[PDB]
Amino acid sequence: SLGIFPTVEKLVEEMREQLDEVDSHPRTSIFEKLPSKRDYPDYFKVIEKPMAIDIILKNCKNGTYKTLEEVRQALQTMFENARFYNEEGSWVYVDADKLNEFTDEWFKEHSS
C-alpha cells in the first residue's frame, strides 16, 4: 500500500510550483535533499533533527509517516532548521517562510 503518499506527493508538487518572483527558482529547491555532510559537516552538529522533502516522501512510502499530522511536524522541523541555520532575509530563509505559509494553508484545508 502507498498509505498517505499520493496526498503528500500532491502537496509536494504544489510546493514545487511556488516560484521566486525574480528568478523563478522553485522555493523547494534547497529543501529537496539534506545538505551534504561533506560540504556542511557542522550543519549536522547544530541541527538536532535534519529533515528534507526526499525523506518526507520516502517516509510516506515506507509507512514511517502514516498521518498528515506526522508530515505536518516533519515540515515544521524542516522549516525551523532553515530559520535557525540561515541568515534572516537570505534566499534560504525567505523560501522557508514562504513555503511554511503555503503548507499551513494546505493543512488548514485538509483539516477543515
Binding site: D20, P35, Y85, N86, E87, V92, Y93
Partner: peptide, 17 residues
C-alpha cells in the same frame, strides 16, 4: 529573493565556524 549565484546555503556567520 533570488538564489545565491553558486546555489549555496546562507549560514549565520557564527555557524560558519
Amino acid at each position: 529573493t533570488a538564489r545565491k549565484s553558486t546555489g549555496g546555503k546562507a549560514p549565520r556567520k557564527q555557524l560558519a565556524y
